[PDB]
Write a protein that binds this ligand. Sequence first.
Ligand code: RL2
Length: 215
Amino acid sequence: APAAVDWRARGAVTAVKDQGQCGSCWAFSAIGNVECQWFLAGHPLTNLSEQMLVSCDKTDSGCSGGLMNNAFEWIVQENNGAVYTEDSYPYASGEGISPPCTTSGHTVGATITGHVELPQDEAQIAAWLAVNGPVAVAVDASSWMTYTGGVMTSCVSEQLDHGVLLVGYNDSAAVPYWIIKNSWTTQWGEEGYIRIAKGSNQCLVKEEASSAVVG
Ligand SMILES: *[C@@H](C(=O)O)[C@H](O)C(=O)N[C@@H](CCc1ccccc1)C(=O)NCCC(C)C
């Protein structure tokens, strides 16, 4: 609802995780979005498995990268809409390799039916996020190793290289900003989060926005 929305303050977001040495940002962005969308559909907030995607999603490339839209379609088209709990399939790719996929011995924590791709417009993305919840986005995170806190008012915006999760915004602050959940532990940034200015396509935030649809 227009002025400021923060889904972390509405019990809709899990704790910050760690991707380690694996190039699995795509899986953390897709699962973080599913966890939020599952809660907002009237279910308890449950931690879900990124490892399920890194090891079993063959339409993406494990620790060499992927795309959240291919991950969402693999869940629906190849895994019968199932997303396992993180406890039944823990992260095992922190050293930079993805072990072979195991198709059993896991528990279904959530299900989805599809996904939507959102417009390349920050005002339109804020409007959808305000009502339907957190959105998976891709950014140029090349300048993010120097982020120590506060609102980043200028960001290098040349090439998308990192998938993250948009969890809110604040249009009433001195400079309007986006609130983003990252997967580089709570020791990075603002306890694992980053605020970037909103309205000028900082870090190319409006280019690849999408979300799973559950129901
Ligand atoms: C992100 C990471 O920091 O771990 C990881 O390198 C990654 O998945 N990068 C992809 C490119 C950036 C991006 C992410 C999500 C959506 C759009 C762009 C990546 O290399 N994609 C590979 C595509 C597959 C099909 C080979």
